[PDB]
């Protein structure tokens, strides 16, 4: 008896969200296996992973051997001794498929208890970065499940072959993925355009993710990103001399800059040679569906305008959003984005938020629709008009006062 699903059926609508790369997936996958009492799905998913690689008529010569049997690494990690380094596990080749498996296993978990109820109905299914993959075949029939993992195996593979990290330095530390805070999307692109003016077409930084109002993410070659890092520092310091003059228009900006743990540039032209190869990799497999070409471009080259997409499905008035992504990523990214517009969001595979899911009474978490506190008009016995607010209601007077002077 799941109230939300029961709500979902008669009452308020729902939307599925899938997280992308940079989710710290392995520790979630390790826990998900340990927290799993049902191995039934993992039997077929492991076999089809073995199968689908063999018939491949696509090039895929380098990829298949560097691919690893998922069942072995898990059982090893369950003996508590074996596991490769985080640097090896975070590489797109083995990471991208593993992230989807964590998400797919996250789908099954809820589907175990309540399936008759916990079956299909979202309004829409949306995804982030490589998360758009697992979105597609979840909306398709169940035989398409590995096709995600199959395409993910292909996505991270070509992306790795085409472009991979050639250097890293403890300071910052410097990745292909960079994030700046507090600064306008226009201002960030300005400094971006200011710096990109000085560099060749081969290594420009570009805006990848716009996470919110003043929070963005710019990406490119780690070295060139480190150069953009220099200009923002100089401006920060020159504006410091401004702030200490005690002037507001003449005040320093207080942004927050710091890199990310992501190993390789995504949504950049540096992955452009990867699209083609990936496309052929799908058609040489039984993966044929017409969106394999569109997903790749969205993931590899085309940027992700995120806030606007999940908001669009949100402005459709769908009250609920779940995220089956590893750890939980994009569940909390979306929350202050929407905040008080009526949306509320439970991380999926999180025990606290799942406690809501499985009960009749603990379910209805619905974040406050600010319009709920919107002022109203009041009449009185002598017939005075009163503008109603949380202030007026208490005091019984107009919501205006002459402050102590």
């Amino acid at each position: 008896a799941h109230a939300l699903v029961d709500r979902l059926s008669a009452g308020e609508p729902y939307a599925v969200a899938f997280g992308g790369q940079g989710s710290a997936w392995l520790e979630t996958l390790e826990e998900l296996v340990s927290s799993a009492g049902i191995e039934s799905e993992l039997a077929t998913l492991a076999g089809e992973a073995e199968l689908l690689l063999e018939p491949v008529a696509s090039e895929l010569v380098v990829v298949r051997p560097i691919g690893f049997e998922p069942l072995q690494w898990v059982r090893a990690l369950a003996a508590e001794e074996p596991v490769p380094s985080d640097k090896q596990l975070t590489s797109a080749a083995v990471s991208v498929p593993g992230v989807l498996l964590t998400q797919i296993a996250a789908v099954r978990a809820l589907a175990r208890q309540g399936m008759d109820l916990t079956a299909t109905p979202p309004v829409a299914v949306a995804g982030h970065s490589q998360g758009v993959l697992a979105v597609q075949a979840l909306a398709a029939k169940g035989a398409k499940d590995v096709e995600l993992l199959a395409l993910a195996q292909l996505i991270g593979a070509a992306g790795t072959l085409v472009a991979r990290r050639r250097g890293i330095t403890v300071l910052g530390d410097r990745p292909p993925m960079v994030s700046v805070t507090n600064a306008d999307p226009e201002r960030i692109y300005e400094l971006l355009e200011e710096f990109s003016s000085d560099v060749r077409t081969v290594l420009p930084p570009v805006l990848s993710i716009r996470n919110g109002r003043r929070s963005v993410v710019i990406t490119g070659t780690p070295e060139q990103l480190s150069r953009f890092e220099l200009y923002c520092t100089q401006i920060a310091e020159k504006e410091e001399a401004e702030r200490k003059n005690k002037l507001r228009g003449g005040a320093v900006f207080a942004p927050v800059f710091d890199p990310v743990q992501v190993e390789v540039g995504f949504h950049t032209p540096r992955l452009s040679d990867g699209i083609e190869i990936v496309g052929r990799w799908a058609e040489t497999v039984g993966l044929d569906v017409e969106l394999a070409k569109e997903l790749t471009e969205s993931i590899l080259v085309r940027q992700v305008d995120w806030v606007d997409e999940i908001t669009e499905l949100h402005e459709a008035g769908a009250r609920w959003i779940l995220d089956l992504g590893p750890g939980d990523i994009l569940t909390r990214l979306t929350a202050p984005v929407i905040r008080g517009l009526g949306i509320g969001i439970v991380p999926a595979a999180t025990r606290g938020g799942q406690r809501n899911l499985f009960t009749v009474g603990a379910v209805p978490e619905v974040a406050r629709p600010w319009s709920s506190y919107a002022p109203t008009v009041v009449k009185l016995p002598d017939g005075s008009v009163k503008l109603e607010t949380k202030f007026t209601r208490l005091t019984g007077r107009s919501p205006i006062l002459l402050a102590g002077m």
């Binding site: 300071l171 150069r227 220099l230 520092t233 100089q234």
Partner: protein, 48 residues
Amino acid sequence: AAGGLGVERFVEIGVKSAPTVAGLATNTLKLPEYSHSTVEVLNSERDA
């Protein structure tokens, strides 16, 4: 910058004349060169 920015070593020779144009370089390495580069300022007198 056009030929690559990798590690450079700046050495001044002439013994006791070495601290000068190095100190000239040092302060210059600071103000325009704030880009955080690995650079070594060496003097024949001091740094032998």
